[PDB]
Design a protein around this nucleic acid. Sequence first.
RNA 1: ACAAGUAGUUAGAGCCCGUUAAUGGGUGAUAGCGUGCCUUUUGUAGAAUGAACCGGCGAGUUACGAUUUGUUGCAAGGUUAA
RNA 2: GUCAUGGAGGUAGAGCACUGUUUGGACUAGGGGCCCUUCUCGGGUUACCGAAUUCAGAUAAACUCCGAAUGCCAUGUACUUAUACUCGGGAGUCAGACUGCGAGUGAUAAGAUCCGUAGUCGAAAGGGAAACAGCCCAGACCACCAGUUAAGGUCCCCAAAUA
RNA 3: AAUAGCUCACUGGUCGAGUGACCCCGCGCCGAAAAUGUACCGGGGCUAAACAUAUUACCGAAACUGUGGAUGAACC
RNA 4: CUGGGGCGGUCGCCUCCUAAAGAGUAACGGAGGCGCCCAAAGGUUCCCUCAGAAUGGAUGGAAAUCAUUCGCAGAGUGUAAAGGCACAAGGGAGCUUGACUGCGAGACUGACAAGUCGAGCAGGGACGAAAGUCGGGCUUAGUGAUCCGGUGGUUCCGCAUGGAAGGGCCAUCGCUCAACGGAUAAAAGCUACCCCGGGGAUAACAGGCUUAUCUCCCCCAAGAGUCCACAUCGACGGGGAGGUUUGGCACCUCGAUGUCGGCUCGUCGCAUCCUGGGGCUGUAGUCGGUCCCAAGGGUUGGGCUGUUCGCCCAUUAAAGCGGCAC
RNA 5: CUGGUAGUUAUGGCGAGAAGGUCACACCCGUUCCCAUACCGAACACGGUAGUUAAGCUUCUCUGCGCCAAUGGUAGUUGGGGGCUUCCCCCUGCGAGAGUAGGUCGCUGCCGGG
Lengths: 133, 73, 56
Amino acid sequence: LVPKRVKYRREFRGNMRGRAKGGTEVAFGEYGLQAVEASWITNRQIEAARIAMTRYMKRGGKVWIKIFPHKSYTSKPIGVRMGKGKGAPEGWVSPVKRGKIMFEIAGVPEDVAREALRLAAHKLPVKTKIVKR
Amino acid sequence: SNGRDSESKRLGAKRADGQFVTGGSILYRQRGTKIYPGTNVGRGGDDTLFAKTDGVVRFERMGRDKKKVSVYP
Amino acid sequence: KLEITLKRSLIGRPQPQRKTVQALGLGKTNSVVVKEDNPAIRGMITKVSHLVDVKE
RNA sequence: ACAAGUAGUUAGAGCCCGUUAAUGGGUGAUAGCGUGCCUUUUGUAGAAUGAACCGGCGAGUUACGAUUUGUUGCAAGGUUAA
RNA sequence: GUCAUGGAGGUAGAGCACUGUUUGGACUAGGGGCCCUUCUCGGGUUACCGAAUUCAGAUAAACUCCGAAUGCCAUGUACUUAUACUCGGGAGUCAGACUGCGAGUGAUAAGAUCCGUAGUCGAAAGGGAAACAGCCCAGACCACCAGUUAAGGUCCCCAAAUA
RNA sequence: AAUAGCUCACUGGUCGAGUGACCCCGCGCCGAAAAUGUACCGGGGCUAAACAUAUUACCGAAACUGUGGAUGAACC
RNA sequence: CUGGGGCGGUCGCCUCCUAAAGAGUAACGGAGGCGCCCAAAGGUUCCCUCAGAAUGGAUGGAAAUCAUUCGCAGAGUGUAAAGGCACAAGGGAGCUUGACUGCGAGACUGACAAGUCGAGCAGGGACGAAAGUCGGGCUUAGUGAUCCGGUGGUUCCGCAUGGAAGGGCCAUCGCUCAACGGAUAAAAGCUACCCCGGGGAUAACAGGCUUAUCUCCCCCAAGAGUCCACAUCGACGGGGAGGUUUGGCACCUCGAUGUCGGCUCGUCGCAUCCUGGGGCUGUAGUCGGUCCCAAGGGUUGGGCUGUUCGCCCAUUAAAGCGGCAC
RNA sequence: CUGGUAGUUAUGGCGAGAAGGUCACACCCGUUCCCAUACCGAACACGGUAGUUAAGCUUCUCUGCGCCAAUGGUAGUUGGGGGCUUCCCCCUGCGAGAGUAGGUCGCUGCCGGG
Ligand SMILES: CCC[C@@H]1C[C@@H](C(=O)N[C@@H]([C@H]2O[C@H](SC)[C@H](O)[C@@H](O)[C@H]2O)[C@@H](C)O)N(C)C1
Ligand SMILES: [K+]
Ligand SMILES: [Mg+2]
Ligand SMILES: [Mg+2]
Ligand SMILES: [Mg+2]
Ligand SMILES: [Mg+2]
Ligand SMILES: [Mg+2]
Ligand SMILES: [Mg+2]
Ligand SMILES: [Mg+2]
Ligand SMILES: [Mg+2]
Ligand SMILES: [Mg+2]
Ligand SMILES: [Mg+2]
Ligand SMILES: [Mg+2]
Ligand SMILES: [Mg+2]
Ligand SMILES: [Mg+2]
Ligand SMILES: [Mg+2]
Ligand SMILES: [Mg+2]
Ligand SMILES: [Mg+2]
Ligand SMILES: [Mg+2]
Ligand SMILES: [Mg+2]
Ligand SMILES: [Mg+2]
Ligand SMILES: [Mg+2]
Ligand SMILES: [Mg+2]
Ligand SMILES: [Mg+2]
Ligand SMILES: [Mg+2]
Ligand SMILES: [Mg+2]
Ligand SMILES: [Mg+2]
Ligand SMILES: [Mg+2]
Ligand SMILES: [Mg+2]
Ligand SMILES: [Mg+2]
Ligand SMILES: [Mg+2]
Ligand SMILES: [Mg+2]
Ligand SMILES: [Mg+2]
Ligand SMILES: [Mg+2]
Ligand SMILES: [Mg+2]
Ligand SMILES: [Mg+2]
């Protein structure tokens, strides 16, 4: 997951105060993985979590990713002093605020849903709750 | 490659609603008409609104979306 | 009619609060002042309620 | 001569004195509190600087102009220079 | 300084009306796979691609149909308070520090760096935090073998509850 | 080796009262390895002398007050 | 200027974000523009409305020019961006030169120098029937002081007098003086042969903070392992600890904190190399693997290189890894 | 009742449906004259009134779109406090945006004709 293009290559880190403004109630699916605390989710983590979910479902049911990594983040190499302008874009993140449903699944029985979602949760840097519609 | 910016131009209201002004007092500095010349108010070449007579400044709604400033003796 | 007593120090307090305590007419800690109960005075007290004690 | 000390200070027995006569002097068991002075610093007990100690010597002056305040004399005048 | 009244201003939040980013579904013009006379012109094919269209759902420092708290400017015949301004004489200062809050840079590192805002230190002794410029409480004119409180405390070191 | 042995999805007997999931909150447990010496409450030590909620006494500053004194300004 | 200096980049002006809903506000923070242009792209009077799509139609194609419909603006506005603009500030046409001279109450901005706006008055005009508008352009960049020179004007001065020379005043021209408040009319390097004044205001060593990186330890378990995730390995991802690495910062020390390796002397940690005890094993035995307890003692001599490190020879029960100003 | 001309944040707009007309107002008829088209009497301008309410206009109906909009709650936040802190919690005051109950097919002048 990467934006096809961006207006600006470099972007403020932002903050993650408050409950997610949208996407707090499960919408397209039966079961959802809900962020309990805030965190940046990288595109690498979304993929690791997606494949874990989907593999356990064995190409059965549907998987909605409800977060998208819109925000770039930069880094400076090792051995580089402070200053001389902002670093090069390194990766893509989705700032997830508490209460945001990150993944939704349908078309599998509860037991399989609840297992696929715990397998996904173990790839994410954020405390999660499983919630059902 | 960045590191540039122009001098800040000190735009915005220069006299308060309900304040007495003398003729020629600049009321609002602006690019374009954020606020329109009301009664006894002129619009200068750079869109500066100035009192044409002495009196009291009143910022008023024009209609729904627009705003004007007037000077009432 | 209110009796206002300055109970906390102004050291470490912002200027607005200090200026209000001054306008109430309070000086040193444990200074007392007697004021007519108006909205003007009530409003001052509200700004510095954490610094003063108020009786009747 | 069982003590851990910027050396005093506050409390204080004991012992020894006796004054510019004072709610006095010397010493100080013991107890509390307590990181010199100066310079330079955001910040120095400083493991930053300077001084071994004592003594002497050792740093905003004068002249001529400017300006301002004070004072005094005279006042639409005042004042002389060589 | 507060109260009342009026006003400028687009932040927080929110929203998706615009611009960008974006998910799923339905729809549907093309293009690309597959055979046919064929010039693959067009059919019969299609989840190999794909531009609009809508339905639902997200997202933003440089998005806004909206929009606070505060702060700001002013008015008053309001209540308190005690300064403002002008003109002269004399300065010093132009290495700041940390803490809290709001931002950037950084790695949402630094006792980092750079602004904004408040405080303390600087130039502030006293009490607390063992010790501890910058934290908590609080401002030392002098004397007293008087009293009441603050933070912090009350078994012993160690004043106060083995409440 | 396969067959059987045991043990059993399934029971009527006993013996007989509770027993099994799931969610939330409080306080704890593991995860937890560094270099001179205990050494991550200042110490002693504490099972409260810890924590939560409520309550009240007291201690505690050069704060404020009391008594005496010195002094600046403004006013009369 | 500079997260030491050099190298690189930058230096003035405009627009936006940063900027915390007045104004202002920093960084070698995030993005773009300017050093002009226009005789109309200025003034005024009158009239007008754009983008795109659908449908139909010769050349004619996805797209040229017609026509109808829908279309608040999805266009345009000389040029960046922001704020404005559809009574248009956008688009036509007619006449024009106000892209005027003297000014200017009063305001904004502001250390100063400068910069900005301005009703209104007078002169004389343009357009308009008039009302009226007009001192350039929708607004905000498009510029540079003084001194010195040049040119034009001039009811100014003219060193005894008349003149003149020369000066003054008004107008205007001549500089990337762009390091853009411009040291001069006129200016590059090397120093390990160096010197003085200073600074821990500022680098090289070590300490400190930080821990990205590094080392170690974990979580999840796709898998590998005939079968079997977990004997042993363990992808994609996730969480820590340590403070030995490579780094960041610049807080102590520049009126000196000697800096690599070795020698001598060790001492400490345990994340254990050997020896001791133990669990699991894909442990028959002999050997091993892996984990747990354990820091008592022990832990070699040579070849090469200044080396540390490393490779090699020969041993050994073993030839541990780290800290102590490496 | 209708023509003209104003004010008022669209509660006033859009869309849909219906009715109406010699008194206006329209369309409408004509290009001789003033005056017009970068071609076009389409428009503008001038002169008419045979025809027509079809359209504009006027009145009436409706909530499909828009617009307006409470209360309550929530976010945020001034001030005051706490934490375990990418952040979160408590007290006091202020208090959205969204959503909603609801509202709206306007209202208020002056002049001429009837
Ligand atoms: C990478 C080095 C870092 C610096 C070293 C040190 C220093 O200056 N050392 C001096 C020494 O010279 C003599 S030893 C020959 C002196 O005896 C000794 O005391 C001392 O001054 C000299 C070697 O340069 N600094 C404090 C930091
Ligand atoms: K997790
Ligand atoms: Mg600026
Ligand atoms: Mg102009
Ligand atoms: Mg305080
Ligand atoms: Mg003794
Ligand atoms: Mg002893
Ligand atoms: Mg010395
Ligand atoms: Mg003098
Ligand atoms: Mg926001
Ligand atoms: Mg925004
Ligand atoms: Mg601060
Ligand atoms: Mg700092
Ligand atoms: Mg100082
Ligand atoms: Mg102090
Ligand atoms: Mg102490
Ligand atoms: Mg000090
Ligand atoms: Mg006391
Ligand atoms: Mg007491
Ligand atoms: Mg006691
Ligand atoms: Mg006192
Ligand atoms: Mg640095
Ligand atoms: Mg550097
Ligand atoms: Mg602002
Ligand atoms: Mg000359
Ligand atoms: Mg002559
Ligand atoms: Mg300069
Ligand atoms: Mg040589
Ligand atoms: Mg330093
Ligand atoms: Mg170092
Ligand atoms: Mg050191
Ligand atoms: Mg610094
Ligand atoms: Mg020395
Ligand atoms: Mg061990
Ligand atoms: Mg050798
Ligand atoms: Mg060494």
